[PDB]
Amino acid sequence: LNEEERLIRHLFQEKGYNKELRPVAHKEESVDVALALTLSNLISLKEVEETLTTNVWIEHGWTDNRLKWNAEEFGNISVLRLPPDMVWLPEIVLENNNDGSFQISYSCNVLVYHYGFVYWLPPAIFRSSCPISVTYFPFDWQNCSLKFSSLKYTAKEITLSLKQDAKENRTYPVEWIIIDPEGFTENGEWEIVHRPARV
Amino acid sequence: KNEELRLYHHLFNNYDPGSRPVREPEDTVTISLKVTLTNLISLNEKEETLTTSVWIGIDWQDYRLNYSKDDFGGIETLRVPSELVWLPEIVLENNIDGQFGVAYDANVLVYEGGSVTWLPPAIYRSVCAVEVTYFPFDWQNCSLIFRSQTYNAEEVEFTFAVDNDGKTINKIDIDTEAYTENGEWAIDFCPGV
Amino acid sequence: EVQLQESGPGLVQPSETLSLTCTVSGFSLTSYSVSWLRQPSGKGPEWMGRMWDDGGTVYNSGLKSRLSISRDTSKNQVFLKMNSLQTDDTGTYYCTRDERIRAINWFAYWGQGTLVTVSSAETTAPSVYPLAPGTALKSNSMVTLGCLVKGYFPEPVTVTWNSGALSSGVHTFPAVLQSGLYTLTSSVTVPSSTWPSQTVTCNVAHPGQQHQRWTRKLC
Amino acid sequence: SEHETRLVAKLFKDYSSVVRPVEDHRQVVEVTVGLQLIQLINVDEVNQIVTTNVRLKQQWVDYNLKWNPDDYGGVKKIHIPSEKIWRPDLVLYNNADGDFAIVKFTKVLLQYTGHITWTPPAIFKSYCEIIVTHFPFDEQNCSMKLGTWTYDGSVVAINPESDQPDLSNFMESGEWVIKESRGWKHSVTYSCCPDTPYLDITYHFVMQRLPLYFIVNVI
Amino acid sequence: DIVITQSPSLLSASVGDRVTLTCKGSQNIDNYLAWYQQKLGEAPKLLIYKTNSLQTGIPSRFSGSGSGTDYTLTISSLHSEDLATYYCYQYINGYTFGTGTKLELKRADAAPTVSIFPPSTEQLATGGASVVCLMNNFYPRDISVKWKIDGTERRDGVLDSVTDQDSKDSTYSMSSTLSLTKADYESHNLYTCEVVHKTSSSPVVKSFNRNE
Amino acid sequence: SEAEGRLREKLFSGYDSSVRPAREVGDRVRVSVGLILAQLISLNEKDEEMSTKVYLDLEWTDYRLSWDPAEHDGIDSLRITAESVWLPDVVLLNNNDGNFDVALDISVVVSSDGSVRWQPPGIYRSSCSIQVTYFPFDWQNCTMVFSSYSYDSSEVSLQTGLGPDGQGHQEIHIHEGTFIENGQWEIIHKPSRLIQPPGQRQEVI
Ligand SMILES: *[C@@H]1O[C@H](CO)[C@@H](O[C@@H]2O[C@H](CO)[C@@H](O[C@@H]3O[C@H](CO[C@H]4O[C@H](CO)[C@@H](O)[C@H](O[C@H]5O[C@H](CO)[C@@H](O)[C@H](O)[C@@H]5O)[C@@H]4O)[C@@H](O)[C@H](O[C@H]4O[C@H](CO)[C@@H](O)[C@H](O)[C@@H]4O)[C@@H]3O)[C@H](O)[C@H]2NC(C)=O)[C@H](O)[C@H]1NC(C)=O
Ligand SMILES: *[C@@H]1O[C@H](CO)[C@@H](O[C@@H]2O[C@H](CO)[C@@H](O[C@@H]3O[C@H](CO[C@H]4O[C@H](CO)[C@@H](O)[C@H](O)[C@@H]4O)[C@@H](O)[C@H](O)[C@@H]3O)[C@H](O)[C@H]2NC(C)=O)[C@H](O)[C@H]1NC(C)=O
Ligand SMILES: *[C@@H]1O[C@H](CO)[C@@H](O[C@@H]2O[C@H](CO)[C@@H](O)[C@H](O)[C@H]2NC(C)=O)[C@H](O)[C@H]1NC(C)=O
Ligand SMILES: *[C@@H]1O[C@H](CO)[C@@H](O)[C@H](O)[C@H]1NC(C)=O
Ligand SMILES: CC(=O)OCC[N+](C)(C)C
């Protein structure tokens, strides 16, 4: 008997999980969702269409206490991979998209950890609207942005926050776009000078 | 009551479109293929894409869909959505835009005696290497490759359709009531192998 | 709880059709598959076929033409019918309830099995010859003497010594088939002085035609 | 005439496409990945995007999809929709403007041993660093980094089918000649997931431009 | 299909002993091996499936092990209830059964009680002339019988059988017969039965000349 | 969140999203149509087509979705996936590419009194008669015609969205603090008008 199947049956069939309900004890409570963006490749910046196309990995993270389990009771399973359709999602979309592609491109598996944390790192190609300052072209610099928000939920329902990371046992917010040297490809035209993030 | 409903329920209440219409696994399904070219839409040499509109006449015997008109009030043909019957899944192998299948899921016609006929229309864009050596007086040997996407030669077997005179149509069929001549490319030969 | 019981004819003529009925108790045929196995005499068991829970059937490729399997879910019965019988079909037939894990099946419960013998020989009365030593090579208090039963058909045959006076000192070797008929031997241990004086007699009975004989010691 | 339907029903009665197809969760799913390149559709230098028609053969043993052929009249292979079974989530890391994962869910071939072969077609629009120095006599080295997105190397291991991509069905392009091809398996650690290295197979193709057209029309 | 062989064909062990029956296939069985116990006159009972999954209600002394093409069934302590025939079978590719391992309780060696009987007068009257040789209460079952007529060995018409272990002493009993016609019987005068058994370096011989 | 699930199950027990929420057979459904322009994406003279990114503001009363909050733990409003409730099939009649419907079916907001509010995002490419004369000093007067595709004026009554104070602010709403200003075109006037039928349908332009 595979322990993963028993764990999934316990979490979803036995517990009666409802993906349409927010993970809160009371309706007045908001779900804290932490977001990070790992830029894998700046595909292009088309000034004529005023469209920035970027390959990104969107790190969603939130706590869903309905998906907690004791690892020792299920064969030491510490992480479980589930279709995103099975679990409740914060439904975060690129607000400033240029083509109507609000949602992520690929619905990869969500990673759920035994302590209830639900983790999601889908890849997406986004074509956001980036107005172009042609003043100093060709020596110009462009201040593009990607604005992520939920449309199915509001500040009363979901609280957005930046990803926190830890060094020397001290936590700090990740207030910048993540660049991973293994996954990042240097674009041939554009050098990233700053890459901040703001809530 | 409508006799077509009785016929449909009789045929399809215990029918599985997943499995082939063979009594034993080692039997081959013989398919009669008849590609009817409606028009040569275009030949883009720059993209090396031949675009054509065709009707894919596919005929086969499905013993599970066998019926006699005497038992169902004289019905000689039943139109059924193609999703309900088993299909050989014939696709254009040498396409270039990724559209392997047909453009419209037309109904299949289940004739009496178990013969199933499908004649869907499809627009196909296919790879045709262009020899520009003798342009503009050139001729092009474009090719269309049809095969089952799923089954090998020991599961599904193709044969050419047979004309009313008994001659095999080992070529692309052209119907005078449907064929529209292309104003740029004339068609000289269309043999099938 | 779970029980299966095979029933059918113990003797069948060659080229006739064998029919076997597996009665079922403790479970419903709509949820458990019932397979048929046979064990030919002197060989290991072999799988003959299966009646699926969904009512379908599957047969051994070597026996597909000769076999038919059916079921009655109201009576909880599974029927096996086999034609073109031959001598090689002699053996013990079992019906088994099959367990499953996904698509894999294995035999979980067995029936007690029915012995089926395929032979044309008609029922025949046994001959009972006495056995006596050809030389007085011994005179101990424990000497073995016996009786030979030959020609009878079909099994079983029973042998006793002086009816209830046989005691535990009796051996009954298994019967052997020769020329289409059975042969059996039996022996008893008796004092060397007792068997020439006491009327030690082997009593043989054959239920095939309710035959009975008694043969005393002769030398 | 109904055994394949019975088999398909038995296999998927309680099959879960979410869990990995291993007997024990501590085991690693071994997936064999073979890229077959059918046609080099386009090499867009100005957008630095290479569009290729591929068949992404993936082979793995699904522990739960075994069956015994004798139970189903000797059926040794079946074709089933890929949406019903568990599949490796192979993602093209260097996707430029296409789909990350496979979207054409063709049928997979399942064998009685549990071996699944899936050969979905795809049009990969991968990113490639176009070197402009030696243009129009340039050789381009374009790669396809394919790997399981969510499963790490200790959970699902992908292995190349052969040291080189399958070019047996490759339609010869009129502008680029594949001078070399090779596939290398790598394990790398990403900042997302420091405790688990992730496996990928990077196929690479050294393609040489045919300069004749550019010689005539430009040079 | 995967051919299966068992070892030993016959195994002797005393009550309480650990026993390990071995089952070997011609191909990888992939742990899809099961063991079942069959007793004379009783319905076979499944012991183990998937090579180690104990059947519900089976005593815990039964355990299974194995991989690839070699598998074993272990009884940690042989009880008197466990004297039976054990079959391994495979259900991953067709259904194939082993020849079976018959397990008997170990017994002290004993020489057979050998006797010989010529065809009686009644048999000769009916034309039957089968000679018979008996070997009562011997162990182990390893035994051989030879018929010699006028000193020359004979094999035609010889048939024999051996009983199972006696429930009280576990010794075997064997009978052998030599069917002959009255003419063939009268053509010779000396008859002897030679019994070879492990308890002696020389065979035990019994003989007779002419009718008793 | 037990009370929310229970209330949702109560509301959708026996509900049918295909049937419009007319109480009596003659009752009309009044739908207030407002428009918020998020970005004037482009204007193309060659295709005579204006591409805009908008948020609709559709508001109506569905009597079937009313409830008393005091019996349901004080829940005074609910967010429900749009596919599960009845929606007016308001479409852009003058679209140029065949995309009548909205770009994303986000959840609607249902008030306890049965008021349903829906603000779906839409990417629209409407046909716009280009004033070719005064190029490049020309000004263009583009129109977006929203109407129910199926229901007649006797079944769904369209209305122009009111202002936040209830004023007849018949204008395209533009949040100047977040509106994505177009680099080539300046919006001067942005009114809205309800057009009455000449089986006929009302329109909001
Ligand atoms: C075109 O461009 C592509 C990429 O876009 C080029 O592909 C690269 O080709 C080279 C060879 O030309 C490859 O190098 C080989 O890689 C394999 C696999 O190595 C992996 O697995 C090993 C097994 O554990 C592991 O040791 C390796 O670790 C390496 O990396 C880490 C960190 O980066 C480092 O710490 C290690 O020291 C290693 O360097 C890695 O995970 C490897 O087996 C090969 O070794 C052979 O060659 C070396 C000497 O070159 C020799 O020492 C060995 O004994 C053995 O003979 C070799 O390293 C490289 O992996 C390919 N990369 C990709 C991304 O595909 C391609 O070459 C270009 N072609 C052109 C320009 O013509
Ligand atoms: C139009 O295009 C068609 C497709 O390209 C052409 O048909 C093909 O033409 C080539 C010409 O080289 C033939 O190739 C030759 O075939 C023969 C026959 O052998 C065949 O059988 C063996 C055994 O199965 C197999 O190995 C071969 O590949 C062939 O299938 C060989 O002897 C030669 O060596 C060589 O391969 C193709 O066979 C032929 N195919 C078909 C389906 O017709 C066609 O000729 C073109 N016509 C014009 C007018 O340009
Ligand atoms: C298909 O069905 C028809 C109709 O039943 C079969 O044709 C015959 O139909 C009559 C009905 O009057 C039956 O009595 C015959 O047994 C049928 N068979 C033959 C051979 O005459 C027909 O056989 C079926 N099969 C095919 C392949 O057409
Ligand atoms: C889980 O891991 C612990 C050690 O961390 C080990 O002792 C225990 O037996 C394991 N349990 C299971 C069910 O694998
Ligand atoms: C867990 C997960 O989704 O990882 C995806 C990112 N990757 C493959 C680069 C590590």
Strand partners, B42: B51
Report d(CA D125, CA A105) in Å as an integer.
Answer: 14
Rounded Cα gap, residues D62 and D88, in angstroms: 11
Interface check D28 vs A, CB under 8 A: no
What token pair was written down for E133? Answer: 């040789």
| CA–CA separation, D152 and B107 (whole Å) | 46
Cα–Cα distance, C89 to C4 (Å, whole number): 22
Structural determination approach: cryo-EM
- Type of residue numbered E97: F
Q: Tell me if B152 CB under 6 Å of ligand 2.
A: no
Cβ atoms of E104 and E12 within 8 Å: the answer is: yes
Report which ligand 3 atom has the smallest distance to the Cα of B66: 1
Write the CB contacts of D106 (distance below 8 Å, at least 6 apart in sequence). B149, B150, D82, D118, D119, D120, D121
Q: Is D60 on the interface with E (CB under 8 A)?
A: no
Question: Which of chain A's residues have a Cβ under 8 Å away from the Cβ of F53?
Answer: 100
Same-fold call for E1-107 versus E108-210: yes
Between chains, do D5 and B18 touch, taking CB under 8 Å as contact? yes
Atom of ligand 5 lying closest to residue D198 CA: 10
Domain range annotation of chain E: 1-107, 108-210
Q: Closest ligand 1 atom, CA of D203? A: 65
Buried b or exposed e, range F116-138, using 16+ CB within 10 angstroms: bebbbbbbbbbbbebeeeeeeee
Strands B29-44 and B49-61: antiparallel
From ligand 5's centre to the CA of A154, what distance in Å?
28
Say if residue F157 is exposed, middle or buried (CB neighbours under 10 Å; 0-12, 13-18, 19+).
Answer: middle
For the record, the structure tokens of E209 come out as: 């000349």
Are the C-beta atoms of residues A101 and A126 closer than 8 Å to each other?
A: yes
Which residues of chain C neighbour D7 with C-beta distances below 8 Å?
103
Residue B154, Cβ neighbours under 10 Å: how many?
A: 10
- Extract the tokens encoding F50: 């204006």
What is the b/e burial string over C41-63, where b = at least 16 CB atoms within 10 angstroms of the residue's CB?
A: eeeebbbbbbbbbeebbbbbeeb
Residue with tokens 């696994």: B25
Q: What is the DSSP letter of A103?
A: S
User: Within an 8 Å CB–CB cutoff, is residue A5 touching chain D?
Assistant: yes
Helix (H) or strand (E) holding D213: helix D212-217
| DSSP secondary structure letters along C196-210 | TTS--EEEEEETTTT
CB count within 10 Å of CB D75 equals: 20
**Ligand positioned closest to the Cα atom of B145:** 2
C-beta of residue B118 within 8 angstroms of C-beta of residue B56 = yes
Ligand 2 pocket, B168 CB below 6 A? no
CB within 8 Å: F79 and A153: yes
First to last CA, chain C: 58
Tally C-beta pairs within 8 A across D and E.
13
Q: Which amino acid is at C139?
A: S
From the CA of B113, give the closest atom in ligand 3: 28
Distances (CA, A) of E151 to C136, E188, E191, E208: 21, 10, 8, 12
Interface residue of F107, F110, F119 to substitute, partner A, most A CBs within 10 Å: F107
Overall CATH class of domain E1-107: mainly beta
Report yes or no: C153 and C130 within 8 Å, Cβ to Cβ. Answer: no
Is ligand 2 within 6 A of the CB of residue B186?
no
Calpha distance D28→D61 (Å, rounded): 11
CATH-assigned architecture of domain C121-219: Sandwich (2.60)
Q: Which residues contact C187 (CB under 8 A, 6 or more apart)?
A: C131, C144, C145, C146, C170, C171, C173, E115, E134, E136, E173, E175
**Interface present between C and F (3 or more CB pairs within 8 Å):** no
Cα-based distances in Å from C36 to C20, C42, E39: 10, 19, 19
How far apart are the C-alpha atoms of D187 and B48, rounded to whole Å? 39
Handedness of CA B59, B61, B64, B70 (dihedral sign): positive
What string of DSSP letters covers B126-167?
EE-----TTTTS--------EEESS--TTTEEEEE-B-TTS-
Interface of F with A in 145-184 (CB under 8 A): 180-181, 183
Closest to D174 in 3D by CA, of D126, D213, D134: D213
Query: Contact F106/A24, CB-based, under 8 Å?
Result: no
Nearest CA among E12, E3, E24, E16 for reference residue E73: E24
Tokens linked to F2: 């037990």
Question: Is B193's C-beta closer than 6 angstroms to any atom of ligand 2?
Answer: yes
- Cβ contact, residue pair D5, B24, below 8 Å: no
State the Cα–Cα distance between residues C100 and F173, nearest whole angstrom. Answer: 65
The C-alpha atoms of residue C96 and residue E40 are separated, in whole angstroms, by 18
Query: Is D69's Cβ below 8 Å from some Cβ in E?
Result: yes
Instruction: List, as one string, the DSSP characters of C52-106.
Output: -TTS-EEE-TTTTTTEEEEEETTTTEEEEEE-S--GGG-EEEEEEEEEEETTEEE
Question: Backbone phi, then psi, for D47, in 5-degree steps?
Answer: -90, -5
| B98 at interface of D, judged by CB pairs closer than 8 A | yes
Q: Which of E124, E130, E198, E189 is nearest to E159 (CA)?
A: E130
Interface probe for C, chosen from E88, E115, E137 (most Cβ of C below 10 Å), is E115
Quick one: E108-210 is in which CATH superfamily? Immunoglobulins (2.60.40.10)
The CA distance from E28 to F116, in Å, is 66
Closest C-alpha residue for ligand 3 atom 5: B68
Domain boundary assignment for chain C: 1-120, 121-219
